[PDB]
Structures are given as C-alpha cells and as structure tokens.
Copies of this chain bind each other. A is one copy, B any other.
Amino acid sequence: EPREEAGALGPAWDESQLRSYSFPTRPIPRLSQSDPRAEELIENEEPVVLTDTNLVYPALKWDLEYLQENIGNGDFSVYSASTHKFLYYDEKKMANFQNFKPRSNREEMKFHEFVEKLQDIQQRGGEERLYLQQTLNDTVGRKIVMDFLGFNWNWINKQQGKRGWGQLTSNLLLIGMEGNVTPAHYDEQQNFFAQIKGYKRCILFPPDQFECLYPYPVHHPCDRQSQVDFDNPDYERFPNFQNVVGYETVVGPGDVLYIPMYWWHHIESLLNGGITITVNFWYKGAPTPEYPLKAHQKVAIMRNIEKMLGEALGNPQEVGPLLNTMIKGRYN
C-alpha cells in the first residue's frame, strides 16, 4: 500500500503513477538502520530500503531554484531523448558496432541552461525528456559543498568498513523529469541509492536471472543492459523473460536503497509526480576470497570469456560465430 506522509498531507503517490508490467514482483524490506536485519541483508548482498540513515539530510531542502543559486557556473552532462526510455550507451564501444545509432544524445551545459530547457519543455507540453547525470567533482558552489560536508559520512564509511568493501568510486547526482525510465541494467559495484526529491520506483532482479534478462553482448555499447523492451517484450527472441520475477519498491525523500553488486535495476520516476533528485554512492566490492559458486561470479566468468574471445580473435564481431561453432551439436 502507498505510504501516508506525516501530518496527513495525503498519499505520497498512487498506483496510477506506476507503469504496468508483464511480470510479478515482491516487496523489498523497508527497515531502520539500527535493525539487525538490515545489516544482515547488506552483508548477504540483498536489497533493503533504509528509512532513517540521514545520509543526505542536508540535501533534502534542494529544489531547482536552490541548486541554480548555489551549484555555480560549471559544466554539467545532460542526456536527452525523444521518449521515456533513457538507454545509456558506452562511447568507447561505439567503434565495436557500426549499425547502431544512439537514440539518446548527450550535451554539456550550464545549470541555468538545463533549467531553461526544463521549464520550456513543460511550458510547451513536449515529449522530450531530460536527465542530469553529473559525477560531483569540484566546480560546485560553497553552499552545496557545505551540504555535501553534512552528509552522514559516519554511517556510510562504517558500512564500507564492515562490508570490507573497497573505495568510494563515485557520487553521481541525478535530476530527471517525471516519467523518466532508466531501463534494466546491472553494475559491477555495490550501490547506495539516496533519494532526495520526488519518488522513484525501483525494480530489482537478482543476478541468477541472467537467463531471463538477456544482456547485450559485452562488446556492445549497451553492455550490461537488458535487451528486453519491458513495455513490449519479445517472447520469441526472449522466451525466458516469461519467467522473470522482480523485487520492487518505491523510494522517496530520505530513503536509501541498497542495490547490491550485480543486481539488475530498472528505475522509473513517477508519472505526473514532478522532477526527481537522487544522489548515488558506488563502492568497489570486497575482493575475492569456494564452491558452490555464486550467480554473480558465474556472471563475472561469462563476461571474462567474452572479453578474452574478442582479444584472441582481434575482432568483437567474431565472438558470436565462434560461440555458436563451439556449442552447435556439441553442448546444446
């Protein structure tokens, strides 16, 4: 059931704001940071919404206005698509596949310019949507640095210690528009996903559902994304999508979602629900210490064979025919 906001301000969100999908899902547990079960889920690399970290307390005041006034005149990466689906591609790998035009084009700008194109689009009721994805570096204004400084570093660094994780690799900041979807993909890093403004539906799939999810080829610029269009699944090409079962939740201002290493996540900003703000924190996982082997290690292996083959053969286009030659009438 949708959560009731304090002081009776009404339901935070309602069902009609969520897209409809072919697969069932179960709920991710919402817990307190002090709960022993949350700690148990994290070490066990299972998802968990932590409702009371205060991780990004100072950022909760943030709207566009405030950020405009304070982030300063630096350069911000802005992605742009004529549709609700924001398929991230990888630029390095574009060389690997020629018959692939990007359907979502990046563009650098200043915050006011991003806010410009934002207010405009809404004022002219357009279908174009936008995402601001910017790895928070240095150019940022004094107040925002003060906001940053006030994040709950005690809590997060102590999680990094207990999990024996490696180093904080990045802090993306995300500002998007209502209805924005980030299609299913997995990451190699442990992730804390800190919600700030707006509501996001997060659907997660364990790594053992590799077979139902059909990642793009490793050398493909969409490496790590599902090939399956969730809005129109192709059961002829992707029969095992019919078997997919997700874990689902809705995060709002103050919630931190642990997205474990190698879990798929598909993320959507609520329809008619306004802009969204998230900040995420990524940590390199603990290093390798044993059988039975875990699903994610098997995924590591498939990736590695694929990388190796592309090297040995001098050509990523040849990986697929070599793999078929290897299994046809032999392993299949």
A240 and B325 CA atoms in complex are apart in Å by 11
Q: Is the CB of A325 within 8 A of B302?
A: yes
Copies in the complex: 2
In contact, A298 and B327 (Cβ under 8 angstroms): no
* A306-329 vs B, Cβ < 8 Å mask (1 yes, 0 no): 101100111000011011111111
A212 to chain B, nearest CB (A): 10
Q: Do residues B322 and A293 form an inter-chain contact, with CB atoms below 8 A?
A: no
Query: DSSP class of A's interface residues: helix, strand, loop or mixed?
Result: helix
Total contacting residues, chain A, CB less than 8 A = 36
A312 touches B322 (CB 8 A): no
**Does residue A21 face the partner (Cβ distance < 8 Å to B)?**
no
A100 at the interface (CB under 8 A from B): no
Which residues in window 58-96 of A have CB below 8 A to B? Answer: none
Instruction: Pick the contact of A322: B301, B322, B330 (CB < 8 A).
Output: B301
A331 touches B320 (CB 8 A): yes
Decide: A326 and B309 in contact? CB cutoff 8 A. Answer: no
- A227–B331 Cα distance when bound, in Å, is 12
A211 beta carbon closer than 8 Å to chain B: yes
17 A-B residue pairings within 8 Å (CB atoms): A210-B325, A214-B329, A215-B330, A240-B328, A298-B313, A298-B322, A301-B312, A302-B322, A302-B325, A302-B326, A305-B305, A305-B308, A305-B326, A323-B326, A323-B327, A324-B332, A327-B327
List 19 additional contacts besides A210-B325, A301-B312, A320-B332; criterion CB under 8 Å: A211-B328, A215-B330, A227-B329, A237-B329, A239-B329, A240-B328, A293-B314, A298-B313, A298-B325, A301-B309, A301-B313, A302-B326, A306-B326, A320-B327, A320-B331, A323-B323, A323-B326, A323-B327, A327-B327
